RNA sequence: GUGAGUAAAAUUUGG
RNA sequence: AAAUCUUUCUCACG
């Protein structure tokens, strides 16, 4: 059906790819494949391009931002039991606290100033010493990414260690304050479909496009590379740091350790490994591993094959190619003009996933796709019509529901099957204004957190510190006492005012009622 | 023996953002085992109980969007909508009232949204979320 | 007095010797790249006919047939499934059936093409069956025209092995179809093909998630007129029918390894080339060393299929 | 059902 | 037995 689309399709309507495979094959592949390359017998990762022209960012302000060093996301923390060294995945935030808590410190900014500001590697920051710390920051964890489309045979992820990661984020800000500097294109705040359009604005004088891609991506990024950039931007001795770590790296697959010389490991580092191509010239559009260049001669197309060859950006063969009247980018499909290539594009359907969030999603999947006019409004009213009576034909049995009232949806025991254009105006019952896609979160959402805060990775007994006075500022400092009094003011004050927990602050449905 | 001595050990100051890192319980992701985790043990079927009759009769009703303009087809651009934050007395009020901490304290941020649409009007309109095919302007 | 990002340590220096010391990678060859037009029709053909031949065809659709009606009722459908589950020696525990495995060969199962079936007017049935049946393993569940039997495989080691799944057991689903193929069962009368499909828990929450009708919807805003198809999906404009197109589809869910995912992206990519690299832009379209099993092999081979039927009637 | 041990307990699986 | 290194945990209390 895909390929009967009179306009482009990339077949996205389908959940992507997923199993239960074991990742320690896709792993020893890309190590092999690294190693082949640091071989020097199948692509080249000796980077040849000059990058003088990249500011030089040695100046600024050593600045950590905590919040992104805490999350629920996996990685891998090094202990040593007798000698020998084990690794454990547990969450980034667990993780992080070890970490602090070896080296006695009160936040990251604090630590990285006390690593910077030994006298000696073997001087101890705690209970350890800058020389331990690298030593245990070169262990990686091998998993599987899934759920990527086009990619039947899923591809392998890492979990790093957390002073990998601080000294990560650092380099990767800094790094990305550069790309925007360098170019327009680059700004923070930019959506994929404008950066298109920046990109069909930049390439539109020259003839012919090359929509091009890279193969082995991440291999063919050297550690030579990655320092030979942060020296050009002036990273200072952060950036030898995570090169001799990132050279020294080790991977365990399964139950043995490997080392892996060459490459980087899935895109640890893309502001970098991005600037090593957009340092040495301006004619290209570099996103990482997705480029787009324009040409009018073959010269022109050899200088281009060149400067990709003297910048590590090995191009594929197999995916790369020349267009005339479109334009690829962050797979995104656009006219030589800018204008949104007909057709369904990259428009992707909804799984089923429960009785309300599946509606949320499918609303949100459809204003989308009607505001940059992919499809005419009827359309619309008509699939998210359909998608109701399928949500209801799924979920409307005693298992998920047991009510009859009229306003409830067709899929809770309800008699209401609202349109698309009485739920985008906010023209129903409060009970539908969870499932509009600026809404507050839907119960079903709502249930799935909570369940997953128990889960064993994530599971703590500590006292939960919430509903927070908005003045007191997330760096201030608080003690067991200091916690225990803040929650017992909170509950005394909403005790006082007849009610147990807070209620929910919605933004939107606030500023609508306010007078 | 504390649980803040065992999970914080050798610190007994640590920041705030660090503590609510560890009981973090409002992040959501869409993953294939939604349908087994809402049917284990009726959690939904209990959830949508206790909404229905503790939680759904404290919505305020907000009025319907009425305003709407003449709309033409035209070159694909981006809209940039701009959403301030609440003041520090709004934010103060909005606690106190007895709202989630949370909510009122990142509502505080200034936002702003960039959305393409391929429609226009005679103006130079800004429109609202999945609207601007059929007019609704944000008026603002 | 601040700290600076490019603040030098004096460690600086040893790390810098320690990396000079460590290997350095080589310089790679030069590529030569020949820039020539999109594959043609009889490249597509030649991929279809090797597949083909390297594969071969199956007598019978296998689990791809259930989406059609077995012609029997409810209560028949499930006598015929209870009592096939008791024939091939199932253990019965708790009202639930369980199947039990000793060693395993290693070896992959034997994989060809699946024929289509004539339609697939219970797709919807089927997936949302599959759906239920693995978070509600063991007996036998019921749609309004077709039924299935979701059975946990767990290992046998005594006395006390198992006696419930965890959340990695694998389930063999088990469905009905009209007789006529080496998978018929008879009992009591009824005569029916039994059908089955090995599913570990990942897969089946992917297939039974999909939503048939809103995708096929979505399909057929802005599609072109599709031509009849012989069982083989060759052109089959006397005999072929319109319908096996949505049993494509169908089978689209059924693939947990979505194959047809990458051939539409390099169609995609195929029908917005003006010039591609020479003998390596076909390889894109080789994806059989990619996927194993008989399902991801028939989903690939007719999404070939298809894409060699669009280059056929609707040339671009 | 809870809690814990395990290079691991399904928010699994990172940038 | 099959989409074949996958269908593989332990302990204490109620
Ligand atoms: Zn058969």
């Not at chain 1, 349109?419 to 509009?436: G, K």
């Not at chain 3, 591609?276 to 092999?297: H, M, N, W």
Request: hydrophobic residues 35%.
């Amino acid at each position: 059906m895909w390929a009967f689309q009179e306009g482009v399709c990339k077949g996205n309507l389908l959940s992507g790819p997923t199993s239960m495979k074991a990742p320690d094959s896709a792993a020893r592949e890309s190590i092999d494949r690294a190693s082949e390359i640091m071989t020097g017998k199948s692509y080249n990762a000796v980077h040849t391009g000059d990058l003088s022209k990249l500011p030089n960012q040695g100046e600024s302000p050593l600045r950590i931002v905590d919040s992104d060093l805490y999350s629920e996301r996996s990685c891998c923390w090094v202990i040593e039991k007798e000698g020998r060294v084990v690794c454990k995945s547990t969450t980034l935030t667990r993780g992080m606290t070890s970490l602090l808590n070896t080296t006695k410190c009160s936040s990251p900014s604090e630590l990285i100033c006390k690593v910077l500001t030994v006298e000696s590697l073997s001087e101890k920051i705690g209970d350890t010493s800058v020389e331990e710390l690298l030593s245990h920051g070169r262990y990686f964890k091998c998993a599987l990414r899934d759920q990527e489309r086009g990619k039947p045979k899923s591809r392998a992820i890492f979990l790093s260690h957390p002073f990998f990661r601080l000294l990560s984020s650092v380099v990767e800000t800094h790094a990305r304050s550069v790309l925007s500097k360098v170019s327009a294109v680059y700004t923070a705040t930019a959506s994929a479909e404008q950066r298109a359009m920046m990109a069909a604005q930049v390439v539109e004088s020259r003839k012919h496009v090359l929509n091009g891609d890279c193969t082995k991506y991440n291999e063919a990024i050297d550690a030579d590379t990655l320092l030979k950039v942060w020296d050009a931007i002036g990273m200072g001795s952060i950036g030898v740091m995570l090169a001799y770590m990132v050279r020294r790296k080790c991977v365990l697959i399964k139950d043995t350790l490997v080392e892996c010389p060459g490459g980087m490991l899935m895109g640890m580092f893309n502001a970098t490994a991005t600037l090593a191509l957009q340092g040495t010239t301006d004619r290209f559009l570099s996103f990482s591993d997705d480029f787009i260049t324009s040409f009018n001669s073959p010269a022109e197309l050899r200088e281009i094959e060149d400067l990709l060859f003297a910048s590590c950006h090995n191009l594929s063969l197999k995916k790369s190619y020349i267009s005339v009247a479109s334009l690829e980018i962050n797979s995104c499909t656009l006219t030589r003009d800018g204008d949104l290539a007909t057709g369904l594009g990259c428009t992707a359907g909804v799984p089923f996933r429960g009785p309300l969030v599946t509606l949320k999603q499918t609303a949100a999947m459809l204003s989308g796709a009607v505001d940059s006019g992919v499809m005419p409004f009827h359309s619309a009213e008509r699939l998210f019509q359909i998608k109701q009576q399928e949500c209801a034909y799924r979920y409307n049995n005693p298992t998920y529901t047991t009510r009859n009232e009229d306003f409830l949806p067709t899929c809770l025991g309800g008699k209401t099957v609202i349109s698309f254009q009485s739920l985008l105006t906010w023209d129903c019952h409060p009970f539908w204004y969870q499932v509009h896609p600026d809404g507050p979160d839907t119960i079903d959402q709502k249930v799935l957190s909570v369940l997953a805060s128990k889960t064993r990775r994530r599971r703590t007994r500590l006292e939960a510190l919430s509903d927070l006075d908005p003045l007191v500022p997330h760096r201030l400092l608080v003690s067991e006492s200091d916690v225990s009094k803040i929650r017992a003011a909170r509950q005394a004050h909403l005790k006082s005012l007849g009610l147990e927990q807070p209620t929910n602050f919605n933004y939107a449905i606030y500023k609508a009622v306010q007078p | 023996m504390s649980q803040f001595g065992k999970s914080f050990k050798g610190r007994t100051e640590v920041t705030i953002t660090e503590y609510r890192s560890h009981t973090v319980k409002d992040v959501h992701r869409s993953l294939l085992t939604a349908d087994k985790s809402l049917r284990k043990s009726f959690c939904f079927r209990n959830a949508l109980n206790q909404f229905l009759d503790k939680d759904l009769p404290l919505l305020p009703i907000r009025p319907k969007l009425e305003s709407r303009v003449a709309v033409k087809k035209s070159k694909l651009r981006s809209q940039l909508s701009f959403r301030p934050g609440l003041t520090q007395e709004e934010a103060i009020d909005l606690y106190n009232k007895g709202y989630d901490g949370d909510s009122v304290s990142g509502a505080l941020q200034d936002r702003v949204v960039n959305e393409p649409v391929a429609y226009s009007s005679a103006d130079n309109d800004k429109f609202h979320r999945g609207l601007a095919a059929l007019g609704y302007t944000l008026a603002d | 007095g601040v700290v600076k990002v490019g603040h030098k340590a004096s460690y600086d220096a040893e790390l810098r010797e320690r990396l000079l010391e460590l290997p350095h990678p080589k310089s790679g060859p030069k590529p030569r790249i020949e820039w020539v037009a999109p594959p043609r029709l009889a490249d597509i053909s030649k991929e279809t006919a090797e597949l083909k031949r390297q594969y071969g065809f199956f007598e019978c659709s296998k689990f791809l047939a259930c989406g059609e009606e077995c012609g029997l009722d409810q209560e028949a459908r499930e006598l015929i499934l209870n009592e096939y589950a008791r024939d091939r020696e199932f253990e019965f525990r708790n009202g639930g059936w369980i199947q039990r495995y000793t060693v395993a060969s290693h070896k992959p199962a034997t994989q060809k093409i699946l024929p289509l079936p004539a339609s697939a007017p219970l797709a919807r049935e089927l997936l949302m069956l599959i759906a239920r049946s693995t978070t509600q393993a063991g007996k036998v569940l019921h749609s309004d025209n077709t039924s299935i039997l979701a059975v946990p495989v767990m290992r046998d080691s005594g006395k006390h092995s198992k006696r419930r799944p965890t959340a990695s057991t694998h389930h063999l689903v088990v469905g009905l179809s009209k007789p006529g193929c080496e998978h018929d069962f008879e009992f009591d009368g009824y005569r029916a093909a039994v059908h089955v499909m090995h599913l570990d828990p990942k897969q089946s929450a992917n297939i039974g998630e999909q939503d048939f009708v809103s995708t096929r919807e979505i399909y057929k805003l802005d599609m072109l007129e599709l031509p009849p198809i012989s069982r083989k999906g060759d052109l089959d404009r006397a005999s072929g029918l319109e319908t096996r197109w949505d049993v494509i589809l169908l089978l689209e869910c059924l693939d947990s390894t979505r194959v047809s995912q990458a051939v539409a992206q390099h169609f995609n990519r195929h029908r917005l080339a003006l010039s591609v690299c020479k003998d390596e832009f076909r390889k894109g379209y080789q994806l059989a060393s990619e996927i194993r099993g008989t399902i991801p092999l028939s989903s690939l081979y007719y999404s070939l299929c298809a894409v060699r039927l669009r280059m056929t009637v609707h040339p671009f």
